[PDB]
Curated annotation (Swiss-Prot):
Keywords: Cytolysis, Dermonecrotic toxin, Disulfide bond, Hemolysis, Lipid degradation, Lipid metabolism, Lyase, Magnesium, Metal-binding, Secreted, Signal, Toxin, Zymogen. This is Dermonecrotic toxin LiSicTox-alphaIA1bii. The lineage of its organism: Eukaryota, Metazoa, Ecdysozoa, Arthropoda, Chelicerata. The active site is at A11, H47. One of its GO terms (molecular function) is metal ion binding. It is found in: Secreted.
Length: 278
């Protein structure tokens, strides 16, 4: 049948100069860590030590500067525009917040994305955005973010946003969080661990089984962080939609092997990231 569109996602893309570095290696999407200040305002794109094996953990930007950089990379006509870059996952490091600041964090995130990435709707960046929350109890972040875009008069930008819960929670617990949040679509499900440690496919398989079921709630599944060809083959064989990596050219190489090329292709802006593949 049709080839499954795949997001090849550059990992830990936290400096503006890295956006081109990863896209030029074959990434059509990136993941970026977002730190918060004491007031739940996104502050830096910063991970810190420890991080993935082989990487510098300390590159960072003021979050709004990173957004302006991402805006340039994703706005047609800009000197820096990368047509290939279609999705950003923000790994929201809400662990530094109290649980009762989750909703505030979502409003401040929306406020900054509207201002600096979507340019108040004036020729904004065009990538789809996934808000990845590490703790199921921080689900009120989603409400906060939607309510802020609505207050600011741009509720339609929610069409460009989707959701993930990154903490490797049991799939039924994740679904219960989305039911609490009133969310029923635009759901990605991460599964993974640092490239420094081993991991199997059992939870990826559970997530894929949910995605492919008639009654499931997941739209896309992505596996992280994968730096080896054999792991990439295993994940594609398991039917994931996305693979996060420190080496986009490694994943591109596998996808260009003749057996995989018949069955997968690199996602473009044509491909809606909230739609389950069939
Ligand atoms: C930066 C303010 C933008 C507007 C934010 C609207 C939602 C505010 C939620 C309560 C935030 C309380 C802490 C405010 C910290 C600050 O920005 O000075
Ligand atoms: C399984 C984890 C889901 C998130 C925890 C949210 C807090 C639970 C209580 C929220 C209100 C109860 C409800 O709406 O059923
Ligand atoms: C949040 C989606 C999954 C992202 C993996 C990034 C890991 C990290 O920052 O340690
Ligand atoms: Mg991260």
């Amino acid at each position: 049948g049709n080839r499954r569109p795949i997001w090849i996602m550059g990992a830990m893309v936290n400096a503006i100069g890295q956006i081109d570095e990863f896209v030029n290696l074959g990434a059509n999407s990136i993941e970026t860590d977002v730190s918060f200040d004491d007031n739940a305002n996104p502050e830096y794109t910063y991970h810190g030590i420890p991080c993935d094996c082989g990487r510098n953990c300390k590159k960072y930007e003021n979050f709004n500067d990173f957004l302006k950089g991402l805006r340039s990379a994703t706005t047609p006509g800009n000197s820096k525009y990368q047509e290939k870059l279609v999705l950003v996952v923000f790994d929201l490091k809400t662990g530094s917040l109290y649980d009762n600041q989750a909703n505030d964090a979502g409003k401040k995130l929306a406020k900054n994305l509207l201002q600096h990435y979507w340019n108040n709707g004036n020729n904004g960046g065009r990538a789809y955005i996934v808000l990845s929350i590490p703790d199921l109890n921080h689900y009120p972040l989603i409400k906060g973010f939607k309510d802020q875009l609505t207050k600011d008069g741009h509720p339609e930008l929610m069409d460009k946003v989707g959701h993930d819960f990154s903490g490797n929670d049991d799939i039924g617990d994740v679904g219960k969080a989305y039911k609490k949040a009133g969310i029923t679509g635009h759901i990605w499900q991460s599964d993974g661990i640092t490239n420094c440690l081993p991991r199997g496919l059992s939870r990826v398989n559970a997530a894929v089984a949910n995605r492919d079921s008639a009654n499931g709630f997941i739209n896309k599944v992505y596996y992280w962080t994968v730096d080896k060809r054999s792991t990439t083959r295993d994940a594609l064989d398991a039917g994931v939609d996305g693979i996060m990596t420190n080496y986009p050219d490694v994943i591109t190489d596998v996808l260009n092997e003749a057996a995989y090329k018949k069955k997968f292709r690199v996602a473009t802006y044509d491909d809606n990231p909230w739609v389950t593949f069939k």
